[PDB]
Amino acid sequence: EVETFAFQAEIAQLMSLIINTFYSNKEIFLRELISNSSDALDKIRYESLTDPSKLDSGKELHINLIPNKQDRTLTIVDTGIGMTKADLINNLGTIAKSGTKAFMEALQAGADISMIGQFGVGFYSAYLVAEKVTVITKHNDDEQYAWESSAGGSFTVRTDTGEPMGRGTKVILHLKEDQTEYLEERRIKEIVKKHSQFIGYPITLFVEKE
Ligand SMILES: NC(=O)c1ccc(O)cc1O
Ligand SMILES: [Cl-]
């Protein structure tokens, strides 16, 4: 069924800082998540160079952006390497304790929240715009898992019996009520063009039934 875990104290503090700090430039969350997708896609590509069978779970390396105004969700889907259960529990495959230290040492040496990705913890920028984040992931040779957190110091992990993914990671942002601009096609397109114009994988922005 469902396992509930406490965030490490430093990660809880990172999340509080992101949620509570007054900071208007919230759109960098999308750059940060697309960058994490690109890094995951680079990892499966590198493994495939010496073991082509690594791509038996899907040959196409890409990123989909899926807005849903009914559900108030923005979903970022990649076909990258995915995460094991251990990776999910260990801060979504990050060195988040040491990265959070460096980041907060930078925020005192002048830096701003937009530089979060330089510290390896850009996933947590999702909480600039999301009240809840759900991560569905599938790594070769492991099962499909669902991570979830509304912050407040805990996350859950369960085996996902939802729609099978093949391989990769899906980040489902349940947007805050005042952050629905990130479901509008023109706003998403503007952000991708501004901050993600050189990413080396196709980024397909899905459209909705009007
Ligand atoms: N390593 C991963 O699978 C991964 C983690 C976080 C994220 O936002 C995207 C990802 O592909
Ligand atoms: Cl660490």
Side-chain angles (χ1 to χ4, degrees), residues 1-58 60-208:
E1 179 246 359
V2 177
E3 293 176 292
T4 304
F5 300 82
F7 288 112
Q8 287 174 282
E10 296 83 357
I11 286 55
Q13 187 178 197
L14 172 65
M15 293 175 76
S16 289
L17 181 152
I18 289 168
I19 293 165
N20 296 328
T21 300
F22 177 77
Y23 182 71
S24 299
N25 180 213
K26 293 182 177 284
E27 67 187 42
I28 62 92
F29 77 93
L30 183 59
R31 174 188 73 198
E32 298 305 330
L33 294 176
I34 291 176
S35 177
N36 288 354
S37 290
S38 177
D39 289 349
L41 287 161
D42 290 350
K43 290 179 194 171
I44 191 61
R45 177 91 84 12
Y46 185 77
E47 291 197 347
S48 80
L49 295 185
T50 61
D51 182 358
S53 69
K54 296 283 189 158
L55 300 176
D56 287 352
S57 52
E60 192 182 346
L61 299 194
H62 67 227
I63 302 172
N64 297 152
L65 307 180
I66 312 174
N68 189 315
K69 289 181 180 85
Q70 290 68 43
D71 294 343
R72 205 204 295 152
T73 58
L74 178 64
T75 302
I76 303 84
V77 187
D78 70 64
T79 55
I81 196 157
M83 290 178 283
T84 65
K85 191 181 177 193
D87 289 326
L88 282 175
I89 293 165
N90 280 275
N91 301 309
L92 303 98
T94 68
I95 53 163
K97 181 177 169 165
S98 60
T100 294
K101 182 173 161 61
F103 182 40
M104 278 169 191
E105 275 166 8
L107 290 174
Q108 87 177 155
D112 67 282
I113 286 171
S114 73
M115 295 168 67
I116 189 171
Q118 295 185 222
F119 311 95
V121 290
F123 166 78
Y124 298 94
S125 70
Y127 289 91
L128 293 168
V129 299
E131 65 184 11
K132 183 172 72 186
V133 180
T134 314
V135 178
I136 317 294
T137 196
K138 175 68 175 79
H139 189 285
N140 287 335
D141 319 298
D142 201 355
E143 309 296 321
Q144 188 165 307
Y145 297 98
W147 178 106
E148 188 167 69
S149 182
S150 297
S154 64
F155 64 90
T156 64
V157 179
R158 67 202 76 192
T159 301
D160 188 44
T161 55
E163 203 53 41
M165 284 172 67
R167 188 201 54 253
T169 295
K170 169 170 20 180
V171 177
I172 307 167
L173 307 172
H174 304 268
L175 298 175
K176 296 166 191 187
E177 186 184 346
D178 64 344
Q179 300 300 324
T180 64
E181 65 194 82
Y182 299 111
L183 301 171
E184 300 289 342
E185 187 183 14
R186 63 181 185 175
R187 183 65 175 118
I188 301 164
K189 280 190 187 156
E190 172 189 45
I191 298 161
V192 171
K193 191 185 159 168
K194 182 177 179 180
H195 296 291
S196 300
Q197 61 266 69
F198 293 115
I199 293 289
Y201 299 97
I203 301 166
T204 303
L205 176 53
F206 288 31
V207 290
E208 302 182 65

